[PDB]
């Protein structure tokens, strides 16, 4: 009953005159010193496209029966590709949907081991190391350096990267000014994640 209803309502959009070949970005060829590497599930798409090309490239023009038989073989190859690509590349653990649609590698992030704040403190405050601060807050520091010290962008970038691995008094003053300027908040907002994530509290 469901299949009959589907066909009876979409019959006007089931026999197109043109079909689109997938985008150039889907098929990636990498040539190295040890050959060219390709993705195996792409195979059916290449075969389907070449099959339609060979119809007019035949030395002897094809009879109408042979034209239909080759056309159907090409169409059957397109159907194989989309099903296999969805099954193998869109729908799996390292797939498009579960790795990039519902997840991402974000910008402006850091990752390091943790220690404790045992001195008198506020429960919702965080201390980050010097190296993380310089690289994470690169454009915050560049904004301050250009305005206060009349540095160019090239000089500011050079200044920040130079002092990642060494202490600098000027950078330290800018760090406090950035934190003090986050008023009325105590500091710069951030989120800390612990894996695996099960309960409220891991984030």
């Amino acid at each position: 009953s469901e299949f009959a209803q589907f066909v009876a309502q979409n019959k006007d959009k089931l026999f197109p005159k043109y079909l689109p070949v997938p985008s150039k970005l889907c098929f990636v060829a990498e040539s190295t010193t040890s050959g060219t590497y390709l993705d195996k599930p792409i195979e059916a798409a290449i075969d389907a496209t070449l099959t339609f090309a060979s119809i007019d490239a035949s030395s002897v023009p094809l009879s109408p029966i042979k034209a239909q038989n080759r056309t159907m073989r090409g169409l059957r190859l397109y159907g194989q590709f989309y099903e296999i690509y969805a099954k193998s590349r869109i729908a799996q653990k390292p797939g498009l949907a579960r790795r990039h649609m519902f997840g991402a590698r974000l910008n402006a992030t850091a990752r390091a081991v943790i220690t404790s704040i045992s001195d008198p403190h506020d429960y919702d405050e965080l201390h980050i190391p010097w190296g993380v601060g310089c690289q994470l807050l690169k454009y915050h520091l560049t904004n301050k350096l250009k305005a206060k010290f009349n540095m160019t962008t090239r000089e500011a970038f050079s200044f920040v990267y130079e002092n990642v691995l060494q202490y600098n008094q000027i950078i330290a003053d800018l760090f406090k000014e950035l934190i003090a300027e986050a008023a009325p908040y105590k500091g710069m907002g951030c989120t800390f994640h612990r894996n695996p994530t099960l309960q409220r509290g891991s984030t």
Binding site: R99, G103, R105, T109, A110, G131, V132, Y161, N195
Partner: peptide
């Protein structure tokens, strides 16, 4: 001077 890599801080579980 330090590793500049994007961190997968937002998985499907997060």
């Amino acid at each position: 001077p330090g590793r500049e890599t994007a961190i997968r801080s937002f998985g499907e579980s997060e």
